[PDB]
Each structure stands twice: as C-alpha cells, then as structure tokens.
Symmetry: none
Subunit: 162 residues, 2 copies
C-alpha cells in the first residue's frame, strides 16, 4: 500500500526566548511507500485550511486521521497549494524586521529560530528569503512575524509589504 | 522548469556497504528561488525511467533537448521517456541486492541489502527496507549482475 498523510507537529506561536541571529497547527506531510516512511514536506492548518507547497504534494489528496482532504486551490509556478478552502494567509513581511522560522525537520521536533531574511531580485520585483539550510522535507515550514502570523513558507519567498 | 542531471554510472561495487547518455540522473525542479530534487531515475538505451509520482508525466528538459513521456501507468507508479519501458530484470527472491542511492544534495552510493518480502493484494514482492530523504525515490536497485531489478520506492518483482 501507499499513503500520503499529515500529522500535527505543534502550535504556531512566536517565542521570545528563541534562538537569535482539521484543527489548527503545523503538520508534517508524510508519505508511506511500502516498507518506508518519509517526510516529504510541511504545512499549515489554519481556519480549517491546509497550506503547503505544490511540490510537496503535487496536488495529491491527503489523509488526515480518518478523513481525506482534497486540494482546493493550486498554482505550480508559485509552488503552492491549499486544501479544503481558498488560500488564507495574507500577511507579508515588513522588509526590515527579524522573523521566526518554525522549522519542522524530518525526524526531529519543531523549533523556532529567529532570523533576518535576505532579499532577492525577481521579474516582479524583489522578495525576502530565509538564509538557512535544513534537510529535505523541511520545506513548507511556516515563517512567522512577531504578531504570530504566517508571512510565508520555508523554501519559498516571503512577500514584502514595503 | 523540471529537468535532469546525471549522478553517475550504474555499476555494482564489491567493496560496498553491506546489511541521452546512460546512467543515473537526479530529477530536479527549478523554483523561483533555488532548485530541488524531486526524485531519481535511470537512463538506459536512450530511455529514461522513473516513477510516475516523481514527474506526473511532466516533460523534462535535458541539456538543451527535452524529453516527452512515452509510457506510463499510475497504479504501478512508473513512467518512461522517449521509448517503452526497458528494464525487464527481476530479483531472484533470495539474493542480496544493491541500492544505488542518489540522495538530494549528496553524491551517489551503493548500498547492499537483502530486501524483505511484502504482501500485496496480488500477491507478494520484494521491498528494500531502508529510509532515505525525500526525492531519493526512483533510485535504481541492482542485482549482482549489474541490472536494474526495480526502483527505490517501487519494490522489486520476484522471479522464482
């Protein structure tokens, strides 16, 4: 048998004493393939909607506890996908404040790490990116502002407000 | 842009860890920012073999050419590019094998293991009991000869 499923890693909260530079939460995206199991990526369940990156799931349904979740919205060149309702994260980075990456690496427990993102040039126009390396399947891990909100997904850009 | 780049020769290796041109290639996707490894496959006799889930039949670009899917079955989770499926070798059901693992970010290696046997609905197959990071699947499984008996994630068909 084969099975792509999600399992909750924890609460999406900020933490002041952190390392400096359907129910809500972060979930691991896992695949069971035969005799193996692996973490293919991470996402955010918020207001009854699952948010992650396209390449993590390729739009596959995901099973959660004892129910299925079917993909509601997707864009592949943005590399994002939402399950069960439309995309719910509209917060953005101010372009100068430190942020906090809530990293769910595969095999290990979630942590918050606090860092100043760097900035890269796009076609339209420039965006903030988290300069840290984390193993493969950590991507889709949420990026928080101090307000506790999701400004972007790890291994993806953060949009800048000004 | 989903694309491929070669990781090495497909050979067995005796001193190994115990329990269009040919070769193994990484399947990579370009994201707006960096790049990521979505799986692995086998180029043999001008045909690229990987797992359907790795690409979902997407075309793949190689060098400056481009590869269009020739064969696919989703239930078996396999796809071939440029000609029909070319790997017909099977596992004997009792010998050690060698997984040629191309994990993401790391150089390829050969690992030698005796697969276990798993029950299917119809009926039973050999499966490699090792865990690798994501995008390592489609990595080729070799017999002692040097032949591809299966892909990592897919299991191996048993001969007799």
């Amino acid at each position: 048998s084969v099975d792509m499923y999600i399992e909750r890693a924890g609460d999406i909260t900020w933490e002041k004493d952190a390392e400096v530079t359907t129910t809500d939460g972060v979930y691991r995206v896992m695949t069971r393939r035969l005799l193996g199991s692996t973490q293919v990526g991470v996402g955010v369940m918020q207001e009854g909607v699952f948010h992650t990156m396209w390449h993590v799931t390729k739009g596959s349904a995901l099973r959660s506890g004892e129910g299925r979740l079917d993909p509601y919205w997707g864009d592949v060149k943005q590399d994002l996908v939402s399950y069960c309702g439309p995309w719910k994260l509209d917060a953005a980075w101010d372009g100068h404040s430190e942020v906090q990456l809530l990293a769910v690496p595969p095999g290990e427990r979630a942590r918050n790490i606090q860092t100043l993102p760097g900035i890269f040039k796009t076609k339209d126009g420039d965006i903030g990116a988290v300069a840290l390396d984390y193993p493969a399947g950590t991507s889709g891990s949420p990026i928080l502002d101090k307000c506790g909100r999701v400004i972007g997904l790890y291994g993806n850009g953060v949009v800048i407000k000004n």
